[PDB]
Structures are given as structure tokens and as C-alpha cells.
Design an enzyme around this catalytic site. Structure first.
Site, PDB file in Angstrom:
ATOM      1  N   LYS A  40      14.526  54.797  -7.073  1.00 49.23           N
ATOM      2  CA  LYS A  40      13.991  55.740  -6.538  1.00 49.23           C
ATOM      3  C   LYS A  40      14.947  56.485  -5.701  1.00 49.23           C
ATOM      4  O   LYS A  40      14.567  57.656  -5.317  1.00 49.23           O
ATOM      5  CB  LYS A  40      12.936  54.758  -5.420  1.00 49.23           C
ATOM      6  CG  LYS A  40      13.575  53.728  -4.561  1.00 49.23           C
ATOM      7  CD  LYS A  40      12.572  53.067  -3.561  1.00 49.23           C
ATOM      8  CE  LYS A  40      12.877  51.752  -3.033  1.00 49.23           C
ATOM      9  NZ  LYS A  40      14.167  51.728  -2.342  1.00 49.23           N
TER      10      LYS A  40
ATOM     11  N   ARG B 129       6.406  47.586   3.859  1.00 45.33           N
ATOM     12  CA  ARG B 129       6.476  46.505   2.589  1.00 45.33           C
ATOM     13  C   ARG B 129       5.137  45.747   2.593  1.00 45.33           C
ATOM     14  O   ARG B 129       5.152  44.712   1.744  1.00 45.33           O
ATOM     15  CB  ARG B 129       7.906  45.859   2.968  1.00 45.33           C
ATOM     16  CG  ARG B 129       8.984  46.355   2.279  1.00 45.33           C
ATOM     17  CD  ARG B 129      10.401  45.716   2.593  1.00 45.33           C
ATOM     18  NE  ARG B 129      11.017  46.125   3.758  1.00 45.33           N
ATOM     19  CZ  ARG B 129      10.856  45.603   5.337  1.00 45.33           C
ATOM     20  NH1 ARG B 129      10.149  44.598   5.258  1.00 45.33           N
ATOM     21  NH2 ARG B 129      11.693  46.137   5.989  1.00 45.33           N
TER      22      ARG B 129
ATOM     23  N   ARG C 219      25.462  44.450 -15.950  1.00 44.71           N
ATOM     24  CA  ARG C 219      26.595  44.535 -14.989  1.00 44.71           C
ATOM     25  C   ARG C 219      27.389  43.397 -14.851  1.00 44.71           C
ATOM     26  O   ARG C 219      26.974  42.270 -15.029  1.00 44.71           O
ATOM     27  CB  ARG C 219      26.165  44.704 -13.632  1.00 44.71           C
TER      28      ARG C 219
ATOM     29  N   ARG D 237      27.374  38.369 -11.326  1.00 42.97           N
ATOM     30  CA  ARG D 237      27.092  37.756 -10.024  1.00 42.97           C
ATOM     31  C   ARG D 237      25.612  37.221 -10.384  1.00 42.97           C
ATOM     32  O   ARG D 237      24.852  37.148 -11.205  1.00 42.97           O
ATOM     33  CB  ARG D 237      27.029  38.834  -9.085  1.00 42.97           C
ATOM     34  CG  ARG D 237      28.328  39.438  -8.959  1.00 42.97           C
ATOM     35  CD  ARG D 237      27.966  41.250  -8.466  1.00 42.97           C
ATOM     36  NE  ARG D 237      29.088  41.848  -8.431  1.00 42.97           N
ATOM     37  CZ  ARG D 237      29.437  43.202  -8.477  1.00 42.97           C
ATOM     38  NH1 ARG D 237      28.021  43.807  -8.457  1.00 42.97           N
ATOM     39  NH2 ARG D 237      30.349  43.711  -8.394  1.00 42.97           N
TER      40      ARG D 237
ATOM     41  N   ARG E 165      12.759  37.843  -8.610  1.00 44.30           N
ATOM     42  CA  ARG E 165      12.802  38.985  -7.570  1.00 44.30           C
ATOM     43  C   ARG E 165      11.586  40.257  -7.731  1.00 44.30           C
ATOM     44  O   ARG E 165      11.034  40.624  -6.747  1.00 44.30           O
ATOM     45  CB  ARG E 165      14.059  39.741  -7.314  1.00 44.30           C
ATOM     46  CG  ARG E 165      14.362  40.695  -6.503  1.00 44.30           C
ATOM     47  CD  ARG E 165      15.842  41.061  -6.098  1.00 44.30           C
ATOM     48  NE  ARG E 165      16.462  41.463  -7.487  1.00 44.30           N
ATOM     49  CZ  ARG E 165      17.656  41.671  -7.615  1.00 44.30           C
ATOM     50  NH1 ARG E 165      18.485  41.129  -6.839  1.00 44.30           N
ATOM     51  NH2 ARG E 165      18.002  42.223  -9.021  1.00 44.30           N
TER      52      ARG E 165
END
Length: 214
Positions: free
Chosen positions: A13, A88, A123, A156, A167
Site C-alpha cells: 500500500k 486497526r 526473500r 528469516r 499473519r
């Protein structure tokens, strides 16, 4: 021009943030920036927020709203602002409306979970260097290895397929009412709302925004 910018983690975003800042002359603001700036300023809400953080506790909705109210009162936001990642929850949205923090547009950035997974999982890092790599968009010269050292790469905990999916599930569930809250306020006429296909190229998203906002 006061804009709220909502979106899932990794939905990108922020990729239109600078465009929105340059076409309205407004700053980008977030609760994070408010916290780190308030504590550094040695202001009152700062010392209060610094205690909660250093104690490892969460910051109360009450304290966050007060910080947002503080920030948008500065000459910085004469022409409005770009609020990033807030509210949120519905109660936060209410407290903002209670605090007279009105908003003109609510932009929702949409990227399906699956595309975010492949985008994030790819990544890699060479930890001792801090160098960043990606399988598809930024591949190293030697597959599964560092271009410089030649030492093996690493991934990671924050980019693992199960961690990312977990998530995203939480965000969708948690933000589902808020998306309905603002969508209802739209058809009510207290503000404006708009879904945005962030899968499109940057140029086309910018175009879509220029018409939504005018």
C-alpha cells in the site's frame, strides 16, 4: 485532503504513498512515527508511552488516539494527512470520530494472500552483510548463495510460508469489521471508501487513484 490507507502486510500500500504526498502536499503519518517522535521529543504523551514500551506492554487505544489528535493539529497537516495502518479496529475508528478526527477517503489495498506469500517467501539474506536477495525479482549470480562472500544465504522467521499465512489470517479476521464499518459510512455519506487492485502496475494504480480522489 485527509486519507486513511489500509492494507494487508506485504500488499504494498505504501507504493503509492509518495504520489499521494506530492499531489496534495500532505505528510505520511503512522502510530509508529508518533510513538518514536513523542518519546524523543520528551513531550508528555512521550514519557507515558516510553514507560509502556520499555515495560514491554502494549499501548492503549486511549493513548494512541491522543497522539493522532496531537499530530494532525500541527501546521504539517494544514492541507490534510496520510494516515498509514490506522485505525486497526472499529473501536479505534470510533474514538477517532469521537476526537473529531474526520477523514475524506479510506483506501483499501488489495493483494490476494497467495501472491503475498510468493512475494514474501522468496526473500533471502546474508546475515553478516545485511544484503538482500529474491528468487524471481532479484536473483543472485549463484543460485542459493551470496554474490560477494560466496557464503550460504539465510531466510528469516518472518518470511516463512506458515508464518506469513498465519499473519494474513489474523489481519483479515481482525480487519473484516473495520472494512465494513467504513464501507457503511460510505453509503451513509460520512466519508468515502474504495477497494484498489494493487496487483496492477504502479502506473495504472496511480491512475485509478487519481480518478477516485479527483
Amino acid at each position: 485532503m485527509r486519507i486513511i490507507l489500509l492494507g494487508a502486510p506485504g500488499a504494498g500500500k505504501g507504493t503509492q504513498a509518495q504520489f499521494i504526498m506530492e499531489k496534495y502536499g500532505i505528510p505520511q503519518i503512522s502510530t509508529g512515527d508518533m510513538l518514536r517522535a513523542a518519546v524523543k521529543s520528551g513531550s508528555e504523551l512521550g514519557k507515558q508511552a516510553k514507560d509502556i514500551m520499555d515495560a514491554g506492554k502494549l499501548v492503549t487505544d486511549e493513548l494512541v488516539i491522543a497522539l493522532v489528535k496531537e499530530r494532525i493539529a500541527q501546521e504539517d497537516c494544514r492541507n490534510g494527512f496520510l494516515l498509514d495502518g490506522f485505525p486497526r479496529t472499529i473501536p479505534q475508528a470510533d474514538a477517532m470520530k469521537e476526537a473529531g478526527i474526520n477523514v475524506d477517503y479510506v483506501l483499501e489495498f488489495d493483494v490476494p494472500d497467495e501472491l503475498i506469500v510468493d512475494r514474501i517467501v522468496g526473500r533471502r539474506v546474508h546475515a553478516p552483510s545485511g544484503r538482500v536477495y529474491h528468487v524471481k525479482f532479484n536473483p543472485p549470480k549463484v543460485e542459493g548463495k551470496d554474490d560477494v562472500t560466496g557464503e550460504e544465504l539465510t531466510t528469516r522467521k518472518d518470511d516463512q510460508e506458515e508464518t506469513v499465512r498465519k499473519r494474513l489470517v489474523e489481519w483479515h479476521q481482525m480487519t473484516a469489521p473495520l472494512i465494513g464499518y467504513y464501507s457503511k459510512e460510505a453509503e451513509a455519506g460520512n466519508t468515502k471508501y474504495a477497494k484498489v487492485d494493487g496487483t496492477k502496475p504502479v502506473a495504472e494504480v496511480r491512475a485509478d487513484l487519481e480518478k477516485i480522489l479527483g
